Amino acid sequence: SLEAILPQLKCHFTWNLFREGSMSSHMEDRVCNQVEHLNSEEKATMYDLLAYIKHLDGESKAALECLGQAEDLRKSEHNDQSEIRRLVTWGNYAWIYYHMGRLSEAQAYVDKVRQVCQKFANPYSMECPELECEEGWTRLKCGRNERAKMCFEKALEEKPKDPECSSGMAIAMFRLEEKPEKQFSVDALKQAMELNPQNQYLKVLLALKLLRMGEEAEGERLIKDALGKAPNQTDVLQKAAQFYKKKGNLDRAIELLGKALRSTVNNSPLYSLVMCRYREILEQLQNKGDADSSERRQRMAELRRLTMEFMQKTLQRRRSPLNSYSDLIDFPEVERCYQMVISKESPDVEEEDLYERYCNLQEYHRKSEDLAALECLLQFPR
Amino acid sequence: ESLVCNLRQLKCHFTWNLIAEDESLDEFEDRVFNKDEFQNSEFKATMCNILAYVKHCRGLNEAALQCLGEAEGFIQQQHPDQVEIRSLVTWGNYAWVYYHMGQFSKAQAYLDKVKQVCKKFSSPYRIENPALDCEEGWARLKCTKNQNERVKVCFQKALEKDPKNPEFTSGWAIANYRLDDWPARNYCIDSLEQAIQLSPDNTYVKVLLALKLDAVHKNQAMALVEEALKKDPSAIDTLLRAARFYCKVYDTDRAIQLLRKALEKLPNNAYVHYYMGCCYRSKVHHMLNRREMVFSGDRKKLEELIQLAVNHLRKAEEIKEMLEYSCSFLADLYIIAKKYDEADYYFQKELSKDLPPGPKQLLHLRYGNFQFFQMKRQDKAIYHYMEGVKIKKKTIPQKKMREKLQRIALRRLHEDESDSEALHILAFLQENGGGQQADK
């Protein structure tokens, strides 16, 4: 009877977060990049999501620890809305215990969620597939096609095949492609920046918009302000380096990424970005007939040390289904830089290795059974 | 009073806030009913509910009650099994209308009925509250890859329920930025094919699949239109959509017969007259490019074209100058017809109307070309090009207008009348040059 109760809850286990079938580099480093730059409300949300990622990786015991920390922050603050936000966390205990086999324990939290939901109940409305179609038709006629698309799409998830919803979704798709929906960016970003006056991430988003619109004096002034106030934030540094790359300056873009790489201990995702940029600048200097320069050497040596450091970093890592999946993605890029940097400049030192062992690890990644099981559950095509 | 507090919690057409940023109710009703007169509705209850809401907004309530009764009748007619679930919105409409009138007992009774149905069919664990609608969405921002469309909806719900909140506003702004940077790509071919195969006898998605795609199908695409007309001869949907499709076919003898059949249905409509004007115009322009030869029928075709265009213009446009955008077609029609005085009359009629900056600069470009071709003088043309370049909208007609200014710079060498206005032209062009080397 407990199996039927679980699908009715709202938690990360009932939202289809990975519907696309495409996943990024493992989110361990992306989800919890920096924790000293956030407030209490954002800290609680991060820990709720971090438990879901860990559980898929197989570390059920560590998942409970991530949930407990978010439990403490929400309990510490006393507020009416804080009680409601607690419903997401209690949904994760029920799913994790039931999977882990502790069926008796999971019944306690299913009981507890019912009293909280009973006090704040709305006795004049409900949710069902039939109530999403009637709203979908009305939004279609009034001319809001984008909102009508999602009312039909969310109704098909409950009923996989339905001749009425399917007809409606095709009409909304046809109307949208005929005339695209308008988007407001500069108005919304300016309005949001006025409500939040101490946020610099929204500053570099607007400047990147203004650069493409045709104004650089406005854009460059905004970025110089943002970098001065918060010069040790990874999010701002990556966006700032992108702006200069779009503008046409590659020297300054390189320096900003090098600063960002030395910011946090979770610098694994940044390795792929920096490696590509050195390849682009070195290929450019061939066009300028600069086959040899103290400056051309001043770049080739740096690419030499980064390739060894990344390869050394990969080998010293615990083996997990998510680590193996992310390793295969970065293999094509790291290989291409290998022949470019070292095989051409000088014969490779045999005794230094860091190669033919890394390649051996790649072959073992494909044969792993645990990766195959994970992809089937997530329905990722091979 | 507690009555309004309870009424605020219902979900119906009144709460959904249908009309927004519409200068009048007349524009709303026209755009919903007359303009897309085709669609009608798959579910007949929506039209009656919308009409009842508009009628109440006008000031009449008995008509609203009658329309709502018709909506309930249609609901009972279509779905007998799910009559309880499907009737939930109309009860809210009764409650709101009765409360507006003053009979509170009926409003209370309908509220009790809604409460009973909700209590019988509700789930004990689920809840709806914008805090959860925000948590779902902060999860999506981190987890998503390229589909940012549901993030924006999740944030709009929370923002609508409680505005002026910094967190919801930040989420909405980020979603809008991400959607603007990389637009969502959607394709109707697979969805349309699936919709047809699941439920035949729809006789609408067939026509949409024909006109939108399957150009390679050719005669096979036309077969869909023939079968759609065969299955339902009384459907105005297929009738209007097939007639517009035949304009691409360039077979007016067939499209006009269909449009006459349609006019036999709704005589007062103006877009029926508009489509006939589009049908002669597309055929005569097609035959003007290379058919040549006797070139006689074209004068007649233009005559009926202009008469139908005027029969359009006399209605639904004198009231609102902006709508149908027909005056440009009228002007170019006279230009092809070689008659110029009514041509400038109608173009000046068009020019006085406000337009968005893009259409404005397009109008300036077109009339600059005209003022060049038909008039010996050049000062008016350079003035109108200056008028257009005064608009700072960035678009490809504006780039063509910069090319026009380069031409006028050549005409400075050719004609002496250009004088210092050419100096201002080259000043603007060197400003543009400074800008483009600034973009580097």
Tab-separated table of N, CA and C in Angstrom, chain B residues 270-365:
chain	number	residue	atom	x	y	z
B	270	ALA	N	-15.445	41.403	-42.865
B	270	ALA	CA	-14.592	42.165	-43.768
B	270	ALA	C	-13.385	41.372	-44.249
B	271	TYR	N	-12.885	40.446	-43.430
B	271	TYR	CA	-11.728	39.652	-43.829
B	271	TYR	C	-12.059	38.726	-44.994
B	272	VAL	N	-13.336	38.366	-45.152
B	272	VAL	CA	-13.759	37.626	-46.337
B	272	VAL	C	-13.486	38.445	-47.589
B	273	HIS	N	-13.797	39.743	-47.545
B	273	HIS	CA	-13.446	40.624	-48.653
B	273	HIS	C	-11.936	40.778	-48.769
B	274	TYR	N	-11.230	40.787	-47.633
B	274	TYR	CA	-9.747	40.913	-47.648
B	274	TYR	C	-9.117	39.729	-48.377
B	275	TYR	N	-9.552	38.506	-48.066
B	275	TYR	CA	-8.888	37.310	-48.650
B	275	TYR	C	-9.038	37.314	-50.173
B	276	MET	N	-10.235	37.658	-50.665
B	276	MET	CA	-10.478	37.749	-52.130
B	276	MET	C	-9.502	38.764	-52.725
B	277	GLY	N	-9.302	39.899	-52.050
B	277	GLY	CA	-8.297	40.875	-52.516
B	277	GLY	C	-6.906	40.267	-52.482
B	278	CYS	N	-6.565	39.510	-51.446
B	278	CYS	CA	-5.236	38.854	-51.488
B	278	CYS	C	-5.195	37.888	-52.679
B	279	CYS	N	-6.280	37.147	-52.945
B	279	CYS	CA	-6.238	36.111	-54.016
B	279	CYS	C	-5.990	36.704	-55.406
B	280	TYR	N	-6.665	37.799	-55.770
B	280	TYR	CA	-6.352	38.431	-57.081
B	280	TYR	C	-4.918	38.973	-57.068
B	281	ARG	N	-4.494	39.596	-55.959
B	281	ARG	CA	-3.154	40.250	-55.899
B	281	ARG	C	-2.020	39.237	-56.065
B	282	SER	N	-2.129	38.063	-55.445
B	282	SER	CA	-0.998	37.105	-55.520
B	282	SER	C	-0.911	36.564	-56.945
B	283	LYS	N	-2.064	36.314	-57.571
B	283	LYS	CA	-2.072	35.768	-58.954
B	283	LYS	C	-1.577	36.825	-59.945
B	284	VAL	N	-2.013	38.084	-59.814
B	284	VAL	CA	-1.623	39.074	-60.814
B	284	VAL	C	-0.143	39.416	-60.683
B	285	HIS	N	0.386	39.465	-59.456
B	285	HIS	CA	1.816	39.693	-59.287
B	285	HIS	C	2.626	38.522	-59.825
B	286	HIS	N	2.145	37.291	-59.617
B	286	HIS	CA	2.841	36.134	-60.168
B	286	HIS	C	2.879	36.179	-61.688
B	287	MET	N	1.755	36.522	-62.318
B	287	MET	CA	1.706	36.554	-63.773
B	287	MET	C	2.357	37.802	-64.355
B	288	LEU	N	2.640	38.809	-63.529
B	288	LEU	CA	3.304	40.009	-64.022
B	288	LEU	C	4.802	39.799	-64.221
B	289	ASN	N	5.413	38.883	-63.465
B	289	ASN	CA	6.868	38.757	-63.493
B	289	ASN	C	7.376	38.260	-64.842
B	290	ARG	N	6.756	37.208	-65.392
B	290	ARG	CA	7.336	36.633	-66.643
B	290	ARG	C	6.287	36.160	-67.664
B	291	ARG	N	4.987	36.143	-67.337
B	291	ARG	CA	4.005	35.569	-68.306
B	291	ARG	C	3.998	36.391	-69.601
B	292	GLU	N	4.017	37.729	-69.514
B	292	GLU	CA	4.142	38.599	-70.724
B	292	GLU	C	3.037	38.279	-71.742
B	293	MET	N	3.409	38.065	-73.013
B	293	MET	CA	2.453	37.706	-74.104
B	293	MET	C	1.365	38.776	-74.282
B	294	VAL	N	0.093	38.366	-74.360
B	294	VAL	CA	-1.026	39.328	-74.619
B	294	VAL	C	-1.120	40.332	-73.466
B	295	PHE	N	-0.967	39.870	-72.218
B	295	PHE	CA	-0.976	40.779	-71.037
B	295	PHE	C	-2.269	41.612	-71.017
B	296	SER	N	-3.416	40.986	-71.307
B	296	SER	CA	-4.709	41.721	-71.354
B	296	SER	C	-5.526	41.476	-70.080
B	297	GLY	N	-5.768	40.216	-69.705
B	297	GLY	CA	-6.557	39.873	-68.533
B	297	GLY	C	-6.131	40.606	-67.277
B	298	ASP	N	-4.875	41.066	-67.227
B	298	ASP	CA	-4.358	41.655	-65.995
B	298	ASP	C	-5.092	42.936	-65.629
B	299	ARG	N	-5.476	43.742	-66.622
B	299	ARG	CA	-6.212	44.970	-66.334
B	299	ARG	C	-7.547	44.668	-65.657
B	300	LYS	N	-8.282	43.675	-66.163
B	300	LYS	CA	-9.514	43.276	-65.497
B	300	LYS	C	-9.225	42.794	-64.084
B	301	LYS	N	-8.294	41.842	-63.951
B	301	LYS	CA	-7.954	41.307	-62.637
B	301	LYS	C	-7.664	42.424	-61.646
B	302	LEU	N	-6.934	43.451	-62.083
B	302	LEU	CA	-6.665	44.593	-61.217
B	302	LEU	C	-7.947	45.352	-60.895
B	303	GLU	N	-8.878	45.420	-61.849
B	303	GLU	CA	-10.128	46.135	-61.590
B	303	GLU	C	-10.939	45.467	-60.479
B	304	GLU	N	-11.192	44.158	-60.601
B	304	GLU	CA	-11.906	43.483	-59.511
B	304	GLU	C	-11.089	43.486	-58.224
B	305	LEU	N	-9.763	43.380	-58.335
B	305	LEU	CA	-8.907	43.479	-57.160
B	305	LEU	C	-9.139	44.776	-56.397
B	306	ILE	N	-9.100	45.908	-57.095
B	306	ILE	CA	-9.232	47.185	-56.409
B	306	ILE	C	-10.651	47.371	-55.887
B	307	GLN	N	-11.655	46.865	-56.613
B	307	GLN	CA	-13.018	47.022	-56.113
B	307	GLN	C	-13.235	46.221	-54.829
B	308	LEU	N	-12.718	44.986	-54.760
B	308	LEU	CA	-12.835	44.226	-53.516
B	308	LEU	C	-12.005	44.845	-52.398
B	309	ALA	N	-10.833	45.395	-52.724
B	309	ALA	CA	-10.027	46.047	-51.697
B	309	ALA	C	-10.758	47.246	-51.106
B	310	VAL	N	-11.442	48.024	-51.947
B	310	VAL	CA	-12.206	49.165	-51.446
B	310	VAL	C	-13.396	48.690	-50.619
B	311	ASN	N	-14.064	47.622	-51.069
B	311	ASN	CA	-15.186	47.083	-50.303
B	311	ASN	C	-14.728	46.593	-48.935
B	312	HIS	N	-13.501	46.080	-48.852
B	312	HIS	CA	-12.888	45.826	-47.552
B	312	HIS	C	-12.682	47.113	-46.767
B	313	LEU	N	-12.025	48.093	-47.388
B	313	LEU	CA	-11.547	49.259	-46.656
B	313	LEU	C	-12.696	50.067	-46.072
B	314	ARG	N	-13.861	50.038	-46.724
B	314	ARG	CA	-14.994	50.825	-46.248
B	314	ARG	C	-15.489	50.373	-44.877
B	315	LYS	N	-15.123	49.173	-44.435
B	315	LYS	CA	-15.560	48.642	-43.151
B	315	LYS	C	-14.362	48.195	-42.324
B	316	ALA	N	-14.520	48.262	-41.000
B	316	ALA	CA	-13.578	47.682	-40.044
B	316	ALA	C	-12.206	48.342	-40.096
B	317	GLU	N	-12.051	49.356	-40.942
B	317	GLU	CA	-10.796	50.081	-41.065
B	317	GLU	C	-10.962	51.580	-40.892
B	318	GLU	N	-12.089	52.142	-41.335
B	318	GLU	CA	-12.377	53.541	-41.048
B	318	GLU	C	-12.516	53.769	-39.549
B	319	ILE	N	-13.027	52.769	-38.828
B	319	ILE	CA	-13.130	52.868	-37.376
B	319	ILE	C	-11.743	52.844	-36.745
B	320	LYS	N	-10.898	51.905	-37.174
B	320	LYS	CA	-9.538	51.764	-36.662
B	320	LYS	C	-8.579	51.746	-37.845
B	321	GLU	N	-7.792	52.815	-37.987
B	321	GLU	CA	-6.918	52.964	-39.147
B	321	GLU	C	-5.825	51.902	-39.185
B	322	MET	N	-5.342	51.467	-38.018
B	322	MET	CA	-4.193	50.565	-37.971
B	322	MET	C	-4.503	49.221	-38.620
B	323	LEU	N	-5.694	48.685	-38.376
B	323	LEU	CA	-5.962	47.289	-38.696
B	323	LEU	C	-5.961	47.032	-40.199
B	324	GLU	N	-5.648	45.787	-40.552
B	324	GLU	CA	-5.566	45.150	-41.862
B	324	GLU	C	-4.393	45.648	-42.701
B	325	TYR	N	-3.756	46.768	-42.354
B	325	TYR	CA	-2.537	47.223	-43.033
B	325	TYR	C	-2.715	47.281	-44.557
B	326	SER	N	-3.954	47.468	-45.017
B	326	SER	CA	-4.258	47.316	-46.437
B	326	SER	C	-3.769	48.475	-47.295
B	327	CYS	N	-3.571	49.660	-46.711
B	327	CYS	CA	-3.301	50.847	-47.518
B	327	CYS	C	-2.020	50.711	-48.333
B	328	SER	N	-1.037	49.953	-47.841
B	328	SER	CA	0.160	49.697	-48.639
B	328	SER	C	-0.181	48.913	-49.902
B	329	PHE	N	-1.033	47.893	-49.770
B	329	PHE	CA	-1.475	47.140	-50.938
B	329	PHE	C	-2.272	48.023	-51.890
B	330	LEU	N	-3.150	48.873	-51.348
B	330	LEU	CA	-3.880	49.821	-52.190
B	330	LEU	C	-2.918	50.709	-52.974
B	331	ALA	N	-1.911	51.250	-52.285
B	331	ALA	CA	-0.947	52.123	-52.937
B	331	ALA	C	-0.218	51.397	-54.054
B	332	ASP	N	0.401	50.252	-53.744
B	332	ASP	CA	1.159	49.523	-54.760
B	332	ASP	C	0.260	49.078	-55.907
B	333	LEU	N	-1.013	48.813	-55.611
B	333	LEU	CA	-1.970	48.484	-56.657
B	333	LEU	C	-2.142	49.638	-57.629
B	334	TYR	N	-2.352	50.848	-57.107
B	334	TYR	CA	-2.414	52.010	-57.990
B	334	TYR	C	-1.103	52.225	-58.736
B	335	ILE	N	0.030	51.932	-58.096
B	335	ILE	CA	1.313	52.148	-58.765
B	335	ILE	C	1.434	51.233	-59.976
B	336	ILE	N	1.042	49.967	-59.816
B	336	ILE	CA	1.011	49.055	-60.956
B	336	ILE	C	-0.021	49.525	-61.977
B	337	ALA	N	-1.143	50.065	-61.498
B	337	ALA	CA	-2.211	50.527	-62.375
B	337	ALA	C	-1.865	51.817	-63.105
B	338	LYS	N	-0.727	52.438	-62.787
B	338	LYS	CA	-0.196	53.629	-63.448
B	338	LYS	C	-0.994	54.886	-63.107
B	339	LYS	N	-2.044	54.766	-62.297
B	339	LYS	CA	-2.812	55.910	-61.817
B	339	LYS	C	-2.177	56.389	-60.517
B	340	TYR	N	-1.795	57.669	-60.470
B	340	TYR	CA	-0.914	58.162	-59.417
B	340	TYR	C	-1.593	59.058	-58.388
B	341	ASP	N	-2.652	59.783	-58.753
B	341	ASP	CA	-3.224	60.745	-57.812
B	341	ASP	C	-3.937	60.052	-56.647
B	342	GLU	N	-4.802	59.065	-56.928
B	342	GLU	CA	-5.328	58.306	-55.794
B	342	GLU	C	-4.231	57.514	-55.103
B	343	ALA	N	-3.156	57.179	-55.821
B	343	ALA	CA	-2.042	56.466	-55.206
B	343	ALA	C	-1.417	57.291	-54.091
B	344	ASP	N	-1.076	58.548	-54.383
B	344	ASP	CA	-0.519	59.399	-53.340
B	344	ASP	C	-1.557	59.714	-52.272
B	345	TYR	N	-2.835	59.835	-52.651
B	345	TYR	CA	-3.879	60.007	-51.644
B	345	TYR	C	-3.859	58.869	-50.628
B	346	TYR	N	-3.900	57.628	-51.112
B	346	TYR	CA	-3.964	56.484	-50.210
B	346	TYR	C	-2.666	56.295	-49.443
B	347	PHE	N	-1.521	56.573	-50.068
B	347	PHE	CA	-0.281	56.460	-49.316
B	347	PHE	C	-0.226	57.493	-48.198
B	348	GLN	N	-0.670	58.724	-48.472
B	348	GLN	CA	-0.698	59.743	-47.429
B	348	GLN	C	-1.680	59.366	-46.330
B	349	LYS	N	-2.771	58.690	-46.695
B	349	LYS	CA	-3.666	58.132	-45.686
B	349	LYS	C	-2.932	57.129	-44.804
B	350	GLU	N	-2.119	56.265	-45.414
B	350	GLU	CA	-1.329	55.310	-44.640
B	350	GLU	C	-0.312	56.005	-43.741
B	351	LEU	N	0.346	57.047	-44.251
B	351	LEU	CA	1.482	57.633	-43.546
B	351	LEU	C	1.044	58.294	-42.244
B	352	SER	N	-0.140	58.909	-42.241
B	352	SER	CA	-0.612	59.610	-41.051
B	352	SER	C	-0.816	58.664	-39.872
B	353	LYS	N	-1.015	57.375	-40.134
B	353	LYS	CA	-1.239	56.410	-39.068
B	353	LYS	C	0.073	56.043	-38.382
B	354	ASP	N	0.013	55.886	-37.062
B	354	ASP	CA	1.165	55.425	-36.302
B	354	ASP	C	1.472	53.965	-36.618
B	355	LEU	N	2.757	53.638	-36.616
B	355	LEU	CA	3.247	52.298	-36.892
B	355	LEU	C	4.449	52.027	-36.001
B	356	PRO	N	4.786	50.758	-35.779
B	356	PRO	CA	6.018	50.433	-35.054
B	356	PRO	C	7.236	50.894	-35.833
B	357	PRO	N	8.372	51.106	-35.159
B	357	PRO	CA	9.539	51.680	-35.857
B	357	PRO	C	9.999	50.882	-37.067
B	358	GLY	N	9.943	49.552	-37.010
B	358	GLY	CA	10.326	48.725	-38.132
B	358	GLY	C	9.448	48.934	-39.354
B	359	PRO	N	8.132	48.783	-39.184
B	359	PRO	CA	7.220	49.149	-40.276
B	359	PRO	C	7.344	50.601	-40.697
B	360	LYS	N	7.650	51.508	-39.767
B	360	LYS	CA	7.823	52.909	-40.138
B	360	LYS	C	8.993	53.080	-41.099
B	361	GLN	N	10.159	52.531	-40.752
B	361	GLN	CA	11.310	52.667	-41.637
B	361	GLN	C	11.106	51.912	-42.944
B	362	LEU	N	10.366	50.799	-42.917
B	362	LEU	CA	10.029	50.124	-44.168
B	362	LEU	C	9.168	51.017	-45.057
B	363	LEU	N	8.195	51.713	-44.459
B	363	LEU	CA	7.379	52.668	-45.202
B	363	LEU	C	8.227	53.790	-45.785
B	364	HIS	N	9.155	54.326	-44.990
B	364	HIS	CA	10.036	55.377	-45.494
B	364	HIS	C	10.868	54.887	-46.673
B	365	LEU	N	11.409	53.669	-46.582
B	365	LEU	CA	12.195	53.119	-47.686
B	365	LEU	C	11.344	52.957	-48.942
